[PDB]
C-alpha cells in the first residue's frame, strides 16, 4: 500500500493567500498527490525546493509550519538560521549532512516508492550568500554552500526531499542555488489587498466568534477599509491589544467594541505612521492669502493625477522658495490631506553623522519599501542638507546626489505609483547641477510680500488685537515686505517677551532689519 | 564525494579521508599491474578544497595540506594508472594550477549554454517518454518551443516541461474541501501550458518582460526621424550577424534630454532578434562604490562573452560615471573601464554590440570617448507642431476639437520638446476639466520653453 | 612520503613518525657502520610539512612544528653520514631559512622550462619507441614540431 | 546578558551563546506542553547585539548572523509560547522593524527622568529603609531635595 502525505488539511491556519498556496501546490505537491500509475509513464522528477521571500510579516513561516504540521510526512528537521556554524572546521558542513542523511538512508534501502522528508531553512540568507566576493575574497561560507548545493542536486540522483527556505533579502542568494532543480519557486508574498486582509481578520476573530463574544456592532469590513497596509501580523497584534483593552476594562463577560478605533492610533505600522507630523507641523497652518490655496490645490490636483492615470507611475515635484517659508510643512500637509497609505519622510534630521554611503542606504531603503506598496508620497526635506552643499567652496556628496537622481528616474514595478516630493531653499545650484531637469515641475512658495497679507496673518494667529494692530498696519502702509514666516513667529515671541511699552517698537525695529 | 565532507576537525584525518580513496586502488595497481578494473572518483564543487596555496587572505585554512597531498598522490613517486578523478566547478580560476596541468587533469573541457539546435535535443529527451506513451498532443512540436527559448540553460529548459505537466495535473485535482479529490482520469496531454510557463520561467540571460519599465508605453511613430533611426539601427545590426572582422560594434543614441533614447535602444535590441541582451543601467546599481560598479559591468560582459552573440545597452552614461557639470567630478575607474571595454576584442569570433545613451556629447568629446564609439546617432526631438499633433493622434488623447484648437497656435510656430515631457504634460492637463484642458496644456507648453 | 601522512591527531605521533622513518638507517649506521646501506627518502611536497617555524601561516598549532624533530635528526647532536633526503616543491621561499643551507639541504636548483634543444630531446624520447616501430610517426619532423611549440614543457 | 560580552571573535560561539538562553525552556516545552512556567530573558544592552542588517551587498553584513539567529528563535517553526523577552537600551532607532514587529517584541516603552514627583517616591523608598530603623530622622524634609534635584536620575 501507499500512504497519502497531507491526509486531513482543509485551508486552515492561514488566510489572505490562496493564489500563492495554489502556485506552490501545483508546482510541488501535485506530483506527490497523484496516482503513481502513470507518473513513470510521464517521467517526472519530484521538485526539491521551495523559497519564500518578503518583508517582515506577511505569513511565510506560518505557511511553512502549516505544511509539515498538517501533513502526515511527520519528519520535519527545521534549521534555526546559522545554528549550523561551529568553531571547528568540518563540523559546519557535517551539521548540514546530518539533515540529509536520514532521507538518503531511506532512499538507498527502500527506493522510488518512499515517504517524504522536509527541511525548513529559517533565514537561509545568513549561511548561504553568493560565493566569490564575501567579507573578503574567499569568505567563510564557501564550505557550507558548496556542500549544500553539491548535495541537493548531487551525483546520487536523490528524490524524497523538500527544502523550504525563508528570507527577507532574496538577492543575496546565489543563482547556482536558485536555478531550477534545487529551488524552483520563489514567491513574492507581500502586503495583502483588502479582500485578503478580511480573510485574515476573520480567521483571527472566528475563535472569538464561536463563543458569544465580540458584540455585533463591530464590522470587519470597515476595519479592512481603514487598515490598508498593516503588513499582516499587526492585524493580530491589534486584535491581541483589543482583547487586552476589553480585558482590563471589565476588571472591577467581556466584549471587544471599536477595537480598531482604540488600537489604530497606538499601533505603529510598516506603512504610514499614524501621526509623526508634529515635528514638521507643530503650530498648524494659517493661510494668509491666495498662494497657499494655489499651491495646495495644485498639490491635490497633482495627487489625483497619479491615482486616476496610467503611463506616468511617478511624478516628482520640487516646491522651493526663499528660506524660512514652510516648504516642508506644505509637503506634509499635501501628504496628510491626500490620504496616502505609505506617506513617509526622508529628513536629513534622521541621518546625521553618517558617511555618504550609509546616507545613501538609509535613503534607498524607504524607496524600496514604497515599491512594495501600491501608492505612496515620499518627501525629501532640505535637499541642500541631505546632499550637503556649502557655498564656500564647491563641495557636495556625489554619491547621494546620483542615487537620488536615478531614484527619481526609477520606473517602479508594474501597478505601483509614487508622488515623490522634494524641498529646497536654493534652486540655482540645482540648475547648475542638473537636478531640476529630473523633476516634473516647480512650486514657488513666496515670502509674505505685502503687509496687507501680514495683518490678516496676524489676526488669524490671534495674538495682537485691534488697537495695536492699527498702529502696525499704519506703519506698514505702502511699504513692501520680504519675510519668511518661520522667522516671523520667532520675531513674534521675541516681541511678546518685552513689556507693552516697547513691545511693538521692538517688533518693528527687528522687522525693519530684513527690509528687502 | 560531496567536496568539503572530507574535512574534519581532527588534524591528519582530514587528509587521511583522502588517502582512504586511493588506498583502495593502489593495492590493485600493486598486485595486478596492468589488468585492473579502473577505480574512479567523482568530486563535486571542488573549488572549496583545492584552491591556490596562497589563499590565506580571508581563508587562513590548512587546506594547503589537502591540495598538497592530492597533488602529490595523483602523479606521485608511485605510478598508478587506473585512477580517474572527475572534477567539476562553476568557479575554475580559484584552483591551484599545479593539479590542473596535464597528467593530473589534462582535459579541462568546459560546457557551454545549449544552442537553439541542441536545446531541441534537450527538450526531445524529456518529451520522448511522453510522446511514446501517447500523452502529449500533436499540435505542439518542439521547434515552436526551441525558437522561443532564447537563453534557457539545462535545468531552466526542463523546468517549463515539469511545470507544464504539473499544471495539467493540477487542473484535475480540484479549496476548502476536506480532501483534494484527484478524479482518476487518464487523459493528460499538456497542450499549451509549456507556452504559458515560458512566461513563468525567467532565465539569466534575457527576460522578455523586463523591458516594461524602460518601454512602458511602447513606441509611437510621431515622424520620419524615428523610422530613420530604427532603420539605421537595423542595418547597423545586420553588420555583426553577417560580417567578420568587426566583432564589436559601438554606437551612441545621443540627443537632448527627455527624448526617449533608451526606449528605442531597447526596441533595436528586440528587433535585432539576438539571443543575449542586457541593459547595464544605474537604476539597479545605486550607492555602489566605483569598484563594485565596475565589477558589475565586468560581470555583464563576462556573461556576454559566453554567448555567440550579444547586445548591451549602457543607459545614462553620465550617471553611470557620475558626471556633474560644476566642480567636475567623475568616476575615473568607471570611465577607464567603460572605455577599455568598448575596444576589447572578444576571443574567438564572438559578436557584440554596445548601445550607449546620454543626453550630452560634449563631455564625452572632452573625455575622449566619442571616437571610441564607432558610429553615433542623433535623436531629434519634436521640433514642430505638425509632428506633435500627429504623435498626439497616435496616442489618441486631446480629441479632434482639442486638436483643431491647438492647431492654429502650433501649426506655423516652433515647438522644441521631447515626448517624455509630452506625456507628463498631457497627463497633468487632463485632470481638471475638458474646457480648461487645452489652455492649461498650451500655457504649460509655453512655460517650459525658455 | 606521499605528501603529509606523518601528521596525526595524537600529539607526539606526528613528531615521532620520523624516528620510524630514520630508525633502520641509524641502525645500519651504528651496526655495520663502515660500509653502509646508503638509504634514501623522497619527502615530497615540503611546502606542506615545513613552514616558518610556526610564526607564519596564521596560528599553526605546535603539531605543525615537526621541523624541529626533523632538524635534530638530520644534523642534530647525533649525526648521520649514511642517508640522504630529497625535496620537491612548487614554492620554495615558503620554507624556513633553516633547512636550505648545507648539512641539512646541501644542493638547491630549479628545473627550468627547457630550451628548444632540450624540448627536442624530450619529445624524441617519447616518440622514440613509436619511431622504432616501422608503422608510426610518419612525416612527424620533431625538429619542426619543436620550433613550433614554443613554451610547452 | 550584556550584548558586548557574548560576541566572540571565533565564528559560531557568538550566535551559539544565545540558544542556551532558550534551550532549557524549550526542553520544558517538550516535557510540559502548555502549562509550563515562564523563563524571562534580559538583554541589558541590545543595540550591540542587534543593528540594522546590511542589504543588497556582500559587504556591510558583519554581525548580522546573531540577529538572524535570535529572530529565528523567538518566533520560528517551533512555536514557543512560554517566554516573554525583555530588551532594554538607550538607542531605540538602531534596531530592526523586523525585530520590533508584533510577535517578537510587541510593545516599546519609554522611561525617562521621573520628575520631582518621581524622585519624591524614590526618596520615600530609600529613606523608608531608614524609617524602618527610625534612626535617620533629623527633620529632613524631602521637598527640599526634590526641588533641588531637577535632572538627577
Amino acid at each position: 500500500s501507499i500512504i497519502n502525505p497531507d491526509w486531513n488539511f482543509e485551508k486552515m491556519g492561514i488566510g489572505g493567500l490562496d493564489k500563492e498556496f495554489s502556485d506552490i501546490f501545483r508546482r510541488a505537491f501535485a506530483s506527490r498527490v497523484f496516482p503513481p500509475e502513470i507518473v513513470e509513464q510521464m517521467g517526472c522528477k519530484h521538485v526539491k525546493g521551495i523559497l519564500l521571500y518578503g518583508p517582515p510579516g506577511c505569513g511565510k513561516t506560518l505557511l511553512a509550519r502549516q505544511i509539515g504540521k498538517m501533513l502526515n510526512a511527520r519528519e520535519p528537521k527545521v534549521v534555526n538560521g546559522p545554528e549550523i556554524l561551529n568553531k571547528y572546521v568540518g563540523e559546519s558542513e557535517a551539521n548540514i549532512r546530518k539533515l540529509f542523511a536520514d532521507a538518503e538512508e531511506e532512499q538507498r534501502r527502500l527506493g522510488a516508492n518512499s515517504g517524504l522528508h522536509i527541511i525548513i531553512f529559517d533565514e537561509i540568507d545568513a549561511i548561504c550568500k553568493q560565493r566569490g566576493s564575501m567579507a573578503g575574497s574567499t569568505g567563510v561560507h564557501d564550505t557550507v554552500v558548496n556542500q549544500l548545493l553539491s548535495k541537493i542536486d548531487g551525483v546520487e540522483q536523490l528524490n524524497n526531499i523538500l527544502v523550504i527556505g525563508m528570507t527577507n533579502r532574496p538577492d543575496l542568494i546565489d543563482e547556482a542555488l536558485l536555478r531550477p532543480g534545487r529551488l524552483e519557486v520563489k514567491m513574492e508574498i507581500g502586503l495583502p489587498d483588502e479582500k485578503g486582509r478580511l480573510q485574515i481578520l476573520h480567521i483571527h476573530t472566528a475563535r472569538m466568534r464561536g463563543h458569544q463574544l465580540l458584540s455585533a456592532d463591530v464590522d470587519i469590513k470597515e476595519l479592512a477599509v481603514e487598515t490598508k497596509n498593516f503588513s499582516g501580523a499587526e492585524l493580530e497584534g491589534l486584535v491581541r491589544a483589543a482583547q487586552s483593552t476589553a480585558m482590563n476594562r471589565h476588571i472591577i463577560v467581556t466584549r471587544g467594541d471599536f477595537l480598531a478605533s482604540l488600537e489604530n492610533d497606538i499601533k505603529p505600522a510598516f506603512g504610514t505612521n499614524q501621526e509623526d507630523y508634529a515635528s514638521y507641523i507643530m503650530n498648524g497652518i494659517i493661510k494668509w492669502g491666495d498662494p497657499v490655496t494655489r499651491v495646495l490645490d495644485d498639490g491635490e490636483l497633482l495627487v489625483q493625477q497619479t491615482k486616476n492615470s496610467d503611463r506616468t507611475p511617478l511624478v516628482s515635484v520640487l516646491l522651493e522658495g526663499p528660506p524660512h517659508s514652510g516648504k516642508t510643512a506644505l509637503a506634509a500637509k499635501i501628504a496628510e490631506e491626500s490620504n496616502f497609505p505609505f506617506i513617509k519622510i526622508c529628513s536629513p534630521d534622521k541621518m546625521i553623522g553618517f558617511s555618504e554611503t550609509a546616507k545613501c542606504q538609509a535613503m534607498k531603503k524607504i524607496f524600496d519599501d514604497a515599491y512594495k506598496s501600491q501608492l505612496s508620497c515620499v518627501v525629501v526635506d532640505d535637499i541642500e542638507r541631505l546632499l550637503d552643499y556649502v557655498p564656500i567652496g564647491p563641495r557636495f556628496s556625489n554619491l547621494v546626489l546620483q542615487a537620488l537622481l536615478v531614484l527619481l528616474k526609477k520606473a517602479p514595478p508594474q501597478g505601483r505609483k509614487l508622488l515623490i516630493i522634494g524641498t529646497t531653499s536654493r534652486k540655482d545650484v540645482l540648475q547648475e547641477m542638473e537636478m531640476l531637469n529630473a523633476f516634473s515641475t516647480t512650486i514657488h512658495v513666496p515670502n509674505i510680500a505685502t503687509g496687507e497679507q501680514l495683518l490678516e496673518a496676524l489676526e488669524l494667529l490671534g495674538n495682537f488685537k485691534d488697537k495695536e494692530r492699527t498702529t502696525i498696519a499704519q506703519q506698514v502702509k505702502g511699504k513692501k515686505v520680504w519675510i519668511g514666516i518661520k522667522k516671523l513667529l520667532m520675531l513674534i515671541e521675541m516681541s511678546l517677551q518685552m513689556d507693552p511699552e516697547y513691545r511693538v517698537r521692538k517688533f518693528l525695529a527687528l522687522l525693519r532689519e530684513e527690509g528687502a | 564525494v560531496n567536496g568539503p565532507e572530507i574535512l574534519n576537525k581532527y588534524v591528519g584525518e582530514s587528509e587521511a579521508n583522502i588517502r582512504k580513496l586511493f588506498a583502495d586502488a593502489e593495492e590493485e595497481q600493486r598486485r595486478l599491474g596492468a589488468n585492473s578494473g579502473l577505480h574512479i572518483i567523482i568530486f563535486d564543487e571542488i573549488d572549496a578544497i583545492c584552491k591556490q596555496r596562497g589563499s590565506m587572505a580571508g581563508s587562513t585554512g590548512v587546506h594547503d595540506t589537502v591540495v598538497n597531498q592530492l597533488l602529490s598522490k595523483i602523479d606521485g613517486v608511485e605510478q598508478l594508472n587506473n585512477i580517474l578523478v572527475i572534477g567539476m566547478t562553476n568557479r575554475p580560476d580559484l584552483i591551484d594550477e599545479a593539479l590542473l596541468r596535464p597528467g593530473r587533469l589534462e582535459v579541462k573541457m568546459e560546457i557551454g549554454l545549449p544552442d537553439e539546435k541542441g536545446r531541441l535535443q534537450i527538450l526531445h529527451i524529456h518529451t520522448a517518454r511522453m510522446r511514446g506513451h501517447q500523452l502529449l498532443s500533436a499540435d505542439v512540436d518542439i521547434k515552436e518551443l526551441a525558437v522561443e527559448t532564447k537563453n534557457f540553460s539545462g535545468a531552466e529548459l526542463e523546468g517549463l516541461v515539469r511545470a507544464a505537466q504539473s499544471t495539467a495535473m493540477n487542473r484535475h485535482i480540484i479549496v476548502e474541501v476536506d480532501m483534494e479529490k484527484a478524479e482518476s482520469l487518464q487523459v493528460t496531454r499538456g497542450d499549451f501550458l509549456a507556452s504559458l510557463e515560458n512566461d513563468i520561467k525567467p532565465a539569466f540571460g534575457t527576460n522578455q518582460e523586463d523591458y516594461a519599465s524602460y518601454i512602458m508605453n511602447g513606441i509611437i511613430k510621431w515622424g520620419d526621424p524615428v523610422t530613420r533611426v530604427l532603420d539605421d539601427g537595423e542595418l547597423l545590426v545586420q553588420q555583426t550577424k553577417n560580417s567578420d572582422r568587426t566583432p564589436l560594434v559601438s554606437v551612441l543614441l545621443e540627443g537632448p534630454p527627455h527624448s526617449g533614447k533608451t526606449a528605442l535602444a531597447a526596441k533595436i535590441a528586440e528587433e535585432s532578434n539576438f539571443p543575449f541582451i542586457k541593459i547595464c543601467s544605474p537604476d539597479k546599481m545605486i550607492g555602489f562604490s566605483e569598484t563594485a560598479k565596475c565589477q558589475a559591468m565586468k560581470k555583464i560582459f563576462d556573461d556576454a562573452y559566453k554567448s555567440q552573440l550579444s547586445c548591451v545597452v549602457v543607459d545614462d552614461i553620465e550617471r553611470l560615471l557620475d558626471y556633474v557639470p560644476i566642480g567636475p567630478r567623475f568616476s575615473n575607474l568607471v570611465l577607464q573601464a567603460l572605455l577599455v571595454l568598448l575596444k576589447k576584442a572578444p576571443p574567438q569570433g564572438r559578436k557584440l554590440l554596445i548601445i550607449g545613451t546620454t543626453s550630452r556629447k560634449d563631455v564625452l568629446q572632452e573625455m575622449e570617448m566619442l571616437n571610441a564609439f564607432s558610429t553615433t546617432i542623433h535623436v531629434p526631438n519634436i521640433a514642430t507642431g505638425e509632428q506633435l499633433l500627429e504623435a498626439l493622434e497616435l496616442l489618441g488623447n486631446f480629441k479632434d476639437k482639442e486638436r483643431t484648437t491647438i492647431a492654429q497656435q502650433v501649426k506655423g510656430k516652433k515647438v522644441w520638446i521631447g515626448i517624455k515631457k509630452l506625456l507628463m504634460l498631457i497627463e497633468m492637463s487632463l485632470q481638471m476639466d475638458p474646457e480648461y484642458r487645452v489652455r492649461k496644456f498650451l500655457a504649460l507648453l509655453r512655460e517650459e520653453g525658455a | 612520503v606521499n605528501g603529509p601522512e606523518i601528521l596525526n591527531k595524537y600529539v607526539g605521533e606526528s613528531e615521532a613518525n620520523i624516528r620510524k622513518l630514520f630508525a633502520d638507517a641509524e641502525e645500519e649506521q651504528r651496526r655495520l657502520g663502515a660500509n653502509s646501506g646508503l638509504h634514501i627518502i623522497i619527502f615530497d611536497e615540503i611546502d606542506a610539512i615545513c613552514k616558518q617555524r610556526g610564526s607564519m601561516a596564521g596560528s599553526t598549532g605546535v603539531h605543525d612544528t615537526v621541523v624541529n624533530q626533523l632538524l635534530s635528526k638530520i644534523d642534530g647532536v647525533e649525526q648521520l653520514n649514511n642517508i640522504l633526503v630529497i625535496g620537491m616543491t612548487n614554492r620554495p621561499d615558503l620554507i624556513d631559512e633553516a633547512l636550505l643551507r648545507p648539512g641539512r639541504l646541501e644542493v638547491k636548483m630549479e628545473i627550468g622550462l627547457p630550451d628548444e634543444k632540450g624540448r627536442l630531446q624530450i619529445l624524441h624520447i617519447h616518440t622514440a619507441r613509436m619511431r622504432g616501430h616501422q608503422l608510426l610517426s610518419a612525416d612527424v619532423d620533431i625538429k619542426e614540431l619543436a620550433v613550433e611549440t614554443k613554451n610547452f614543457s | 546578558v550584556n550584548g558586548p560580552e557574548i560576541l566572540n571573535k571565533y565564528v559560531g560561539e557568538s550566535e551559539a551563546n544565545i540558544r542556551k538562553l532558550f534551550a532549557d525552556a524549550e526542553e520544558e516545552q517538550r516535557r510540559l506542553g502548555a502549562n509550563s512556567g515562564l523563563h524571562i530573558i534580559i538583554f541589558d544592552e541590545i543595540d550591540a547585539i542587534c543593528k540594522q542588517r546590511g542589504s543588497m551587498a556582500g559587504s556591510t553584513g558583519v554581525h548580522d548572523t546573531v540577529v538572524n539567529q535570535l529572530l529565528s528563535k523567538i518566533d520560528g517553526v517551533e512555536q514557543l509560547n512560554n517566554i516573554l523577552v525583555i530588551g532594554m537600551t538607550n538607542r531605540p532607532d538602531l534596531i530592526d522593524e523586523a525585530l520590533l514587529r508584533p510577535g517578537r517584541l510587541e510593545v516599546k516603552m519609554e522611561i525617562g527622568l521621573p520628575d520631582e514627583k518621581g524622585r519624591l517616591q524614590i526618596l520615600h523608598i530609600h529613606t523608608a529603609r531608614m524609617r524602618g530603623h527610625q534612626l535617620l530622622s533629623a527633620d529632613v524634609d524631602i521637598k527640599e531635595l526634590a526641588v533641588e534635584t531637577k535632572n538627577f536620575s
Partner: peptide, 17 residues
C-alpha cells in the same frame, strides 16, 4: 573583526593505564 578564525584542536590525553 578578523573573521574566519576557524581553528582545530588535537587529542593529547590518550587516557590509558
Amino acid at each position: 573583526m578578523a573573521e574566519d578564525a576557524d581553528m582545530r584542536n588535537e587529542l593529547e590525553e590518550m587516557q590509558r593505564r
